[PDB]
Amino acid sequence: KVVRQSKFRHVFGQPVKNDQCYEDIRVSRVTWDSTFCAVNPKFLAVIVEASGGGAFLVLPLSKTGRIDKAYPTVCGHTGPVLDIDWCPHNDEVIASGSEDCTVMVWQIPENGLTSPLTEPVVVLEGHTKRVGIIAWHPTARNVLLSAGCDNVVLIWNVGTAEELYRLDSLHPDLIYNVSWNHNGSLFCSACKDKSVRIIDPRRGTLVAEREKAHEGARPMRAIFLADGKVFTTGFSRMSERQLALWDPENLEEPMALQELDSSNGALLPFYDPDTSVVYVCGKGDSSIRYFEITEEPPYIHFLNTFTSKEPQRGMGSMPKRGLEVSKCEIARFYKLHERKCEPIVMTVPRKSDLFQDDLYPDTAGPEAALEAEEWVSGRDADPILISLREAYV
Amino acid sequence: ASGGGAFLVLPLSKTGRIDKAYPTVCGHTGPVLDIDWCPHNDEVIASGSEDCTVMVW
Amino acid sequence: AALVVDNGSGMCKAGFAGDDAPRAVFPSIVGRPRHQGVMVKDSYVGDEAQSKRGILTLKYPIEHGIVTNWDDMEKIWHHTFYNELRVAPEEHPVLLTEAPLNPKANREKMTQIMFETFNTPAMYVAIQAVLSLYASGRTTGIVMDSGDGVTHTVPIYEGYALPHAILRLDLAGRDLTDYLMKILTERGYSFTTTAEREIVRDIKEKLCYVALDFEQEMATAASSSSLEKSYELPDGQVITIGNERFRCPEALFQPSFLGMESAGIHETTFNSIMKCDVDIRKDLYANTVLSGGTTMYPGIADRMQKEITALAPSTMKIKIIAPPERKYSVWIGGSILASLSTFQQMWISKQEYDESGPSIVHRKCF
Amino acid sequence: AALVVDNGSGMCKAGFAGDDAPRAVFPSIVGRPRHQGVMVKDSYVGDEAQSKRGILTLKYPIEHGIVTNWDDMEKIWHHTFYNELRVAPEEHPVLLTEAPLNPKANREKMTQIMFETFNTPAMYVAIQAVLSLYASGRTTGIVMDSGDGVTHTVPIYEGYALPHAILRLDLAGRDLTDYLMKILTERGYSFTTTAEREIVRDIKEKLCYVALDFEQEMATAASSSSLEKSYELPDGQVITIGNERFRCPEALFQPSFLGMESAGIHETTFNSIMKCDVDIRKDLYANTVLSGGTTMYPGIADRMQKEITALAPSTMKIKIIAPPERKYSVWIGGSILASLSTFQQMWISKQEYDESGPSIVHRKCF
Amino acid sequence: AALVVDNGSGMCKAGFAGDDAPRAVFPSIVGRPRHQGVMVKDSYVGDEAQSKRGILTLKYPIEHGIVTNWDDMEKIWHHTFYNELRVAPEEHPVLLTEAPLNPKANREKMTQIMFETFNTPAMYVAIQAVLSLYASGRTTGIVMDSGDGVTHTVPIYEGYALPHAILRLDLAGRDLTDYLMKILTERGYSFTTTAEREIVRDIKEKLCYVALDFEQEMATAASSSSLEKSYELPDGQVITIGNERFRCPEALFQPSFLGMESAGIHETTFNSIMKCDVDIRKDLYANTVLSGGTTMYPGIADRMQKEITALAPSTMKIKIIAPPERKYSVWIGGSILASLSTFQQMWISKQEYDESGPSIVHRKCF
Numbered sequence A: 001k002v003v004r005q006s007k008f009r010h011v012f013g014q015p016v017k018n019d020q021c022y023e024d025i026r027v028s029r030v031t032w033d034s035t036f037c038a039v040n041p042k043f044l045a046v047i048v049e050a051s052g053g054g055a056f057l058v059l060p061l062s063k064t065g066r067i068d069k070a071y072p073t074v075c076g077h078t079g080p081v082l083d084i085d086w087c088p089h090n091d092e093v094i095a096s097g098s099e100d101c102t103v104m105v106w107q108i109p110e111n112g113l114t115s116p117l118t119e120p121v122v123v124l125e126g127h128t129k130r131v132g133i134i135a136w137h138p139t140a141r142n143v144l145l146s147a148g149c150d151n152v153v154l155i156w157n158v159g160t161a162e163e164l165y166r167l168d169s170l171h172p173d174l175i176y177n178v179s180w181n182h183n184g185s186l187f188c189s190a191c192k193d194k195s196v197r198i199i200d201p202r203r204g205t206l207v208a209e210r211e212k213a214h215e216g217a218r219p220m221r222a223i224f225l226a227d228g229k230v231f232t233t234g235f236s237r238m239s240e241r242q243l244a245l246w247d248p249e250n251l252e253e254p255m256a257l258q259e260l261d262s263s264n265g266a267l268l269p270f271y272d273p274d275t276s277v278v279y280v281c282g283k284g285d286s287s288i289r290y291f292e293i294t295e296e297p298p299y300i301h302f303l304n305t306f307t308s309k310e311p312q313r314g315m316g317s318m319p320k321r322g323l324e325v326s327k328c329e330i331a332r333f334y335k336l337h338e339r340k341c342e343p344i345v346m347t348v349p350r351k352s353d354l355f356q357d358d359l360y361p362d363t364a365g366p367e368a369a370l371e372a373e374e375w376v377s378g379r380d381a382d383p384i385l386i387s388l389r390e391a392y393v
Numbered sequence B: 001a002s003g004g005g006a007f008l009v010l011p012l013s014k015t016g017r018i019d020k021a022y023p024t025v026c027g028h029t030g031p032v033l034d035i036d037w038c039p040h041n042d043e044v045i046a047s048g049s050e051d052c053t054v055m056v057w
Numbered sequence C, D, E: 001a002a003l004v005v006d007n008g009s010g011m012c013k014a015g016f017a018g019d020d021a022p023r024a025v026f027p028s029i030v031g032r033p034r035h036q037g038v039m040v041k042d043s044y045v046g047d048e049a050q051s052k053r054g055i056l057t058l059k060y061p062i063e064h065g066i067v068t069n070w071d072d073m074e075k076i077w078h079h080t081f082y083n084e085l086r087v088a089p090e091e092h093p094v095l096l097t098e099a100p101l102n103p104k105a106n107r108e109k110m111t112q113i114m115f116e117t118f119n120t121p122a123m124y125v126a127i128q129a130v131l132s133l134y135a136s137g138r139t140t141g142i143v144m145d146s147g148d149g150v151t152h153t154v155p156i157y158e159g160y161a162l163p164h165a166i167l168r169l170d171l172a173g174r175d176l177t178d179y180l181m182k183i184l185t186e187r188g189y190s191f192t193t194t195a196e197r198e199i200v201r202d203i204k205e206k207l208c209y210v211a212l213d214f215e216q217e218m219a220t221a222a223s224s225s226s227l228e229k230s231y232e233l234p235d236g237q238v239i240t241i242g243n244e245r246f247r248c249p250e251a252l253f254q255p256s257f258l259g260m261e262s263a264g265i266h267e268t269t270f271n272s273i274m275k276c277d278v279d280i281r282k283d284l285y286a287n288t289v290l291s292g293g294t295t296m297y298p299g300i301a302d303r304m305q306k307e308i309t310a311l312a313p314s315t316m317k318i319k320i321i322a323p324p325e326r327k328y329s330v331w332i333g334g335s336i337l338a339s340l341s342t343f344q345q346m347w348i349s350k351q352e353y354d355e356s357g358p359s360i361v362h363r364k365c366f
């Protein structure tokens, strides 16, 4: 009664040792506000600065320490790379969007890169402007979403290089981010007109829209939760960063609205469906704040904040399959400095050294539920769940 | 003194902390070695320095 | 209804969050009989031990801020919840106070006792010096907390503490009480037993004061009877003390009276300020806050201002803040803190402690 | 109402076009706490960081004219538009300044930030040395812009710049501030933290000067106390400095004091003139313009005239132009340029940048 | 028979040129009585002050490499020549050692005392870091001289010093002794007086070590008693310390433990190398020489190698040279230098000093 019932009220962040970091990495200098980093249990992908065109550095997780300046990179784009996203169903497939108005899908060798990679597997050319948004389908296999600066959202079939759907007359201004829902049947997007839109891609219709979700003119984000709600980070009229929770069945007023501070930089939300914990990481900030989303009011509970002395240029989150379960680790964040990638370990303090069933429920596995052909027909399936107990040592 | 030589002359009533920029008797070009008040004049003092000169103030 | 417990070396103040003054203030003593019973309770804690101290041997479970006996420590806490506050400890969250630079082992035992013996639903530990700044409504200042066991100087600037500049002086009220006993023998009064120590402590709290100029006061007391005062013993005898009124508190500013090599409270406060950054010393000079019962002598604030002014540069404004309620500043600041809506995130649940241990208490605490 | 923003290594000057002086001048520093908060903002930029520097670690986003952290660089610009000027960047065109021989990558990042992060309607980037010539009302001359990060010598003849004759000297005010810190230790004063760096910088800006004859000044300081000056620290302590007043600025003319192999500012200016064509050296000798805060030392113009005269032939007339407002010459020239009727053709629209990219910025800019 | 005197902040080493080890090594302390004599020498210097330290107030004439009292400084020198060495100072030339970047005023006073007070026939002052490199038999390398008052990093290449690359760290053995005193209170042991400072210093010199992995060592110390050691106090009491063995030396690599904003000795050494020319950094990486008593911790060479390797490029070979006799490297190098045939030209006569002054001492010395 005195203390709100929670398991993550004492989660603390702890950066890894110096020898476990990645140094001498020329991180990208693009003003586009993206994560600049994508990490799977196998490789680490960081967008890097190239003299000509664009490239991103893909290196194995075991390759820590100082990185050679002549290390091979994935340099195939003729323009700077904006977004990178690993395939959830294939640890060696990554899609990258660049300023050359194209989307390329790459195949990474098992042991890494020995020579520079220039020829991709599939080149997607459907955008007339730069593509800064990429999101793989959580369930359907080889289904990729790309949203360029032409205010056009495209659904691609990576296997057949086919454009499944085209959504043009749905965003009047610049699109900030696009996030799929749990099953993959819907996706939410934040636009420059301060409007949150829930759109069905297979039907091309607007499900729900909230105009002026955040009154500020600064960039804002919108992501989908596991239970089916929308968590948005934005700014107020007084240039104060806010967090909001929206019900897709009732958007007249937000369920929650909390103000964090008055600093600049867009807030990038990192959602963990297993723990229902949202990690808010602002660009240029030196702190990581995590909040728990529950049904009890005010539906947004501040847990704690990890504080550092160096601002972050980007940040990627390791999925559940790559975490160290035996050490009660629930999240790992690869914080990007200007010349270094510093992993940060989020650990739930527990006296017992055994496997914690409550901390690790069943998580989505690397096996696709449906296929591209099946998903187009209208089939909906939940992600296949695996057990994290086998990872205990 | 950083350069030359000087000695601090202050009234007996001026007690407590003394300002670092308090005026001194800085006329010698070398460090002052000895000072002696005139017994017959409480306002006359002679000083000897490393510049091989004796100055009466 | 959260509980605020400020347990010191000599006195224990307890109450409820939101109140203006502690509801239960009793001495932190445990008395045991030293004679044999001839007519047909083996320990007394607090005021009941003070009313029967003639047949008891009084012992302080805390000495110099160090708990010398944890069995007697639990008696003080048990007496607080059940006999003084008359509440169930398992139904109210408890806010506790700790000395600056408190060892983690001391905090672990205090946390373990509250959660395992008294089964408190929630518990938090706060720094006494920080709480003293809460009561004065300040975020910047240096707190000179002089209690019964030890004296501490904690500089705080804009809500940020400077542990490297925290200085400790092993000289407090109990050391002054023993010094008064020693110098009262020179006047012909002999106090030796532990029961008579409380009598001398009452004399110290009622007749002692800090002289602005010790040498002038000593000369005045040697040529006049104006400074003379009388005290009535519990058995009706009246004792009379002269220069001992200001000689006993003088050991605070001249620890050499007790054979101590350390410097006085005025120099300890000045040295703590000098250990801070140069850009924050100006704010610490004008925000010197006095806390604790030992700082309750009449004229101690004027002497503190005069002594620090002679040490600080002439361009600095020395301001000694001595609120009339500073004897309970630590508790009042804790009551204010425990009532803030933004403090509810700092509570540590009993269920969280069981599954996590004392590691979550070292974090969330400073 | 066009904005003129002059961002340097140490100071940022901002204001409105047409004004005679910058409205906002604040240090280009970002401070972050280095202690732990104990009382119930993770970064401070500009003056608010200077007022809290005791508990902060001050860092310069620009070092040696190179932006070492673009995240902190955006904080300076955000603090300029919203906290200093209190204007909306999307409603006013912004005129920016760039160092001579500015890398194209540096200009691309600055252009991208203003058009995407701040969404400015129009933007233009001008050369600092060219703008400093505008303030003096000249079209021909060599500008020695010595600031906080780097010293530049830019010869301009009849409105035509000579990039091949532009010389760079990695020695500016910040290097002199560090040198003053090193030589102040010889007098017994220890300044080590970043907070004390700003204190030493204040000493340099108030007590330092350039001696016409360094050897004679050293002899004068070694046999007299007339060159002594006193400075009061923030904590009220007073320090005295002697020959360090003119020894610190002497590193500008004798870089060997810092272990540097390069030549002094007088020789760098002369070498830049000799790199030009013979027919234009006569006009550059008589039009030597001093710009930046590092040229504000008393007597630097007389020393510069004496040193250059020795290097130059006897028949050439050496004239050093040191306007009293040369600390803000870059901003003043920018406000003059942005107020011209013929400058409206040099603006670059946000819409033009979105459809053409940074290619149109490399053109129309020098 | 020339004399080699190596006077430091904490210890004074003296002897004769040509010997392999100093003949007299005694603490650089001056003790004065703090009680009143009741039974029918007002100062004690060196070992006699250490034997009577229970009734004396021990004071160091040198603090942080700065002589805070020249009257007590002459007592150390007088005790050196007459009590320890038992020689006449006027019959033997004296070779003295000075800290890097020594102020000229400090050198003038030392020269004046040796010639006017002790009337030495000849005298010379050498840099401690250079003498440390003499003992190792090298002409190229960077010397990390950490002692009792201050830590210095001096890079030398082919016998040429680089004063601009010399870095200073205000953190040495005495700061670690005070830190051990602070963290020993968390274990229940109270050391406050100056006499107990020498006891804690003895504990540090006997039980402290540097952990290769600090966090791993803390985990080992928190789950086992293998890192536990016992120390016997002079009065027979036995104290026991655990993780404090490696926590106290860790302040060298993490100065934030003391609230200091500066960097560790590993980064200070790395930063000094980076301040040198690029063509000489390779030789400095492989010739890192440790000197002083503060570098005598077990495992400090391995930790320094690991920390510097993480900073330097992977293609550089990091070699830390830690000779077993490095506690006396400055004296041993001075003994070697004073015995060289090509050194007799560097002596300065008393007659020359009388007719010329300290000017001839600033020359012929670096």
Ligand SMILES: Nc1ncnc2c1ncn2[C@@H]1O[C@H](COP(=O)(O)OP(=O)(O)O)[C@@H](O)[C@H]1O
Binding pocket: C007, C008, C009, C010, C011, C012, C146, C147, C148, C149, C173, C174, C201, C204, C205, C206, C292, C293, C294, C295, C296, C297, C327
């Ligand atoms: N009015 C007073 N004048 C002088 N001394 C006092 C006064 N009131 C209390 N004291 C002394 O102050 C000491 C410490 O009181 P307190 O602050 O309760 O200690 P603690 O910090 O251990 O709780 C007591 O030993 C008492 O003798």
Ligand SMILES: Nc1ncnc2c1ncn2[C@@H]1O[C@H](COP(=O)(O)OP(=O)(O)O)[C@@H](O)[C@H]1O
Binding pocket: D007, D008, D009, D010, D011, D012, D146, D147, D148, D149, D173, D174, D177, D201, D204, D205, D206, D291, D292, D293, D294, D295, D296, D297, D327, D328
């Ligand atoms: N009166 C002064 N005397 C000497 N130096 C000064 C003075 N005023 C400013 N400076 C120096 O000028 C430097 C910055 O000057 P300025 O060129 O105006 O800005 P920036 O170099 O940051 O563009 C500062 O580092 C400061 O030390």
Ligand SMILES: Nc1ncnc2c1ncn2[C@@H]1O[C@H](COP(=O)(O)OP(=O)(O)O)[C@@H](O)[C@H]1O
Binding pocket: E007, E008, E009, E010, E011, E012, E146, E147, E148, E149, E173, E174, E177, E201, E204, E205, E206, E292, E293, E294, E295, E296, E297, E327
């Ligand atoms: N074996 C040891 N282990 C750790 N520290 C030591 C050891 N021996 C001496 N020290 C430390 O070295 C410091 C002084 O060393 P030294 O360089 O000889 O003195 P100085 O710097 O005054 O010349 C002392 O403070 C002492 O604590």
Ligand SMILES: [Mg+2]
Binding pocket: C007, C008, C009, C128, C147, C292, C330
């Ligand atoms: Mg108390």
Ligand SMILES: [Mg+2]
Binding pocket: D007, D008, D009, D128, D147, D292, D330
């Ligand atoms: Mg400038």
Ligand SMILES: [Mg+2]
Binding pocket: E007, E008, E009, E128, E147, E292, E330
């Ligand atoms: Mg030494």
